[PDB]
Design a protein around this ligand. Structure first.
Ligand SMILES: NC(=O)c1ccc[n+]([C@@H]2O[C@H](COP(=O)([O-])OP(=O)(O)OC[C@H]3O[C@@H](n4cnc5c(N)ncnc54)[C@H](OP(=O)(O)O)[C@@H]3O)[C@@H](O)[C@H]2O)c1
Ligand SMILES: NC(=O)c1ccc[n+]([C@@H]2O[C@H](COP(=O)([O-])OP(=O)(O)OC[C@H]3O[C@@H](n4cnc5c(N)ncnc54)[C@H](OP(=O)(O)O)[C@@H]3O)[C@@H](O)[C@H]2O)c1
Lengths: 383, 383
């Protein structure tokens, strides 16, 4: 069979010859009990670059050893690309949210042999789940593989916005000192009200990391968390997102992208936030209305916005989020740290070993199965 | 009855006429029980810029009402400055560590009327304690006033170094995407070994904030924390700093500057750290040997360095910490966030009110009193 795998490019300085450290911590389980991926073996050392074209997610020796073909490419847009040319023959498509091979209904139509679509990572919104359902296509992602990695990115970005990190760093590069310029917009996070849109694998991990900062914790979700967990953390629940953002100094978005959350943060919901609120979105770009964020930062309604997710991906050189004021953006990198890569690459292989051995894919990896939202998809997703 | 106050300059864009937010949270006491400053009143709203020349720590109206004169300037370097010209006449000298009026022995001999030296902030290493001891000069500082603010700054910088935050942000501004360039040096903090030098007010707050990141926590100190505290946080105690740094992926410095800590992180100690370790120093610049940090980064013995403290302060344009590779520095700002300012300005007034009404200054504020180390100075420094 043919496996089509879309990865981002190697560094512009070439595939790395060395890394800054010698290894990465071994991670055996996730908070709440889910085990680390269980492939029969791995053909990489955890810590190496696996998400780029030359890394190949460490799949080539295994897949070719079973006689299948593996096409790895980064070239993913247009009828002319390696991706779309090879798509009609692929039994399996793999890509990462960081450089995603969008599986629109047109591409799924052209994909005559496509049976399995794997998200090397978390969040399968780049696949058209409705069209995947109409074609008997199993959709699967490596659940939890980088949820912790994002929570660190979230707390790092909250602190950078509130304490005014990046402009102060720029004063160091500029050769200045300029204390008053740095701190005329620099605050402590302590005793601020911080709320999260969703309290899932990421959102809960964020809430735990924020607790010893002595913030006042809030959250909004379709389902309420267990009342014990609310009490051990000091949570206040809000059945309405508008209710939360009205009392919150800082807001983190940690929900998946689907019709229920698309454009959730428009000019109207943002205009309901406290003046000078901080908004962090490591979930998906479209959950925040792009020009609304830009406008609210110009007026001082938002005192800062930071995140790593954009729309589309890659973001074009002129995308207005690059130049809007008071931001702390990165590209889509939080879920593809080298530590996270070792996990979802191992999970991708685990899914592949299950597919070619006719074993069930882990119920918690499943988003679509047999023409239905299933598994995690039934519980986190809407179509 | 002359008070000599050295503060940093107003912003170059002018003293602020508005702020990004309406208020700041009311900080009530510090962890462990110490009360917030208790001046009889304050002449500012918590949240205003107090540490610049126009802020005057909010002391003019108070001090002039009592018939004293308040002289405020930022000009502080050398024999030939407003500070040294006004010194022979001042009974009280106040400065902040962020823009510090060095009370060297030579200047203390000239300060013919000086009886009180107040640190508007924490850390009085800019005052030559030995000379102040000989000349019977009381030295005080607003203990705990910004310890929590620093612990936030530390966790922010740990995450930024490890996750490669700032170079990734740069790719956003340069118009790129460059996922593999961002993440070929990007790791998760989860399950790494993190150690703190000292576990006082800052170090303990650093440790509590790190605990939910699921790191393995280490600490070195001249004296052990209580067993109950070690057990609840998961700490490993090390009797020497060499013993700690050899197993630590990340090291935070949170000890005062005094003979026991001067030049502690020199070439020899740094070469005992793990290859690719991260070093964070929000304590005082001189605890790290300046050029030893640079060489260790240039060679990759340290994967990154971050801190807000320098020697001297302000740091000159050509200071090598500005241009060394893999750094995430700020100027000396963590202790002078607007939230922190409101507390040590309140506390500075409290120390002055006690002085003028002949009531004792708080024992925990005291560093030098009655010709020897006193109060906290007896506990944390040496000479
Ligand atoms: N590199 C990155 O930046 C990165 C990495 C991984 C993931 N992500 C994004 O983050 C998303 C969540 O990650 P995760 O690990 O936490 O997955 P998860 O375990 O399924 O958590 C998602 C939670 O969102 C809740 N929620 C769902 N729909 C909602 C809605 N319409 N309104 C409010 N809340 C809603 C769901 O709970 P309820 O049913 O109780 O509402 C769910 O618990 C992912 O789907 C992905 O899009 C980004
Ligand atoms: N804006 C900023 O960046 C900022 C702000 C505030 C403070 N600081 C710096 O951070 C320092 C500490 O602040 P803090 O609030 O935590 O004061 P603190 O409460 O007195 O804590 C200092 C601790 O250092 C310990 N220690 C002392 N000497 C040591 C040594 N030779 N080796 C190892 N550990 C030693 C002491 O404990 P043991 O007796 O057990 O050793 C003490 O508990 C301050 O002195 C200041 O220089 C920086």
């Amino acid at each position: 069979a043919k496996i089509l795998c879309v990865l981002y490019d190697d560094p512009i300085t070439g595939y790395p010859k060395s890394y800054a450290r010698a290894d990465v911590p071994k991670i055996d389980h996730y908070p709440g009990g889910q085990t680390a991926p269980t492939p029969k073996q791995i053909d990489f050392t955890p810590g190496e670059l696996l998400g780029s074209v030359s890394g190949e997610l460490g799949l080539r020796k295994y897949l070719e050893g079973l006689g299948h073909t593996l096409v790895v490419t980064s070239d993913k847009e247009g009828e002319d690309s390696v991706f779309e040319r090879e798509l009609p023959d692929a039994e399996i498509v793999i890509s990462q949210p960081f450089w995603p091979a969008y599986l629109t209904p047109e591409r799924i139509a052209k994909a005559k042999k496509l049976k399995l679509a794997v998200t090397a990572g978390i969040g399968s919104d780049h696949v058209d789940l409705e069209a995947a359902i109409k074609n008997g296509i199993t959709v699967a992602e490596v659940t939890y593989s980088n949820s912790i990695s994002v929570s660190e990115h979230v707390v790092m970005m909250i602190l950078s916005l509130v304490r005014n990190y990046i402009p102060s760093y720029q004063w160091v590069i500029k050769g200045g000192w300029n204390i008053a310029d740095c701190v005329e917009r620099s605050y402590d996070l302590e005793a601020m009200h911080v709320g999260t849109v969703a309290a899932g694998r990421i959102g809960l991990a964020v809430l735990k990391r924020l607790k010893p900062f002595d913030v006042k914790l809030h959250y909004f979700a379709r389902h309420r968390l267990p009342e014990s967990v609310e009490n051990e953390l000091g949570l206040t629940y809000h059945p309405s997102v508008e209710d939360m953002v009205k009392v919150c100094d800082v807001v983190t978005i940690n929900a998946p992208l689907h019709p229920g959350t698309l454009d959730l943060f428009n000019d109207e919901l943002i205009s309901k936030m406290k003046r000078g609120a901080y908004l962090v979105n490591t979930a998906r770009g479209k959950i925040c209305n792009r020009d609304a964020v830009v406008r609210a930062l110009e007026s001082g309604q938002l005192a800062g916005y930071a995140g790593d997710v954009w729309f589309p991906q890659p973001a074009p050189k002129d995308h207005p989020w690059r130049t809007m004021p008071h931001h702390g953006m990165t590209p889509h990198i939080s879920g593809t740290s080298l530590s996270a890569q070792a996990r979802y690459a191992a999970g991708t292989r685990e899914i592949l070993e299950c597919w070619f051995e006719e074993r069930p894919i882990r119920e918690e990896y499943l988003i679509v199965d047999g023409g239905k939202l299933a598994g995690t998809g039934a519980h986190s997703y809407t179509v």
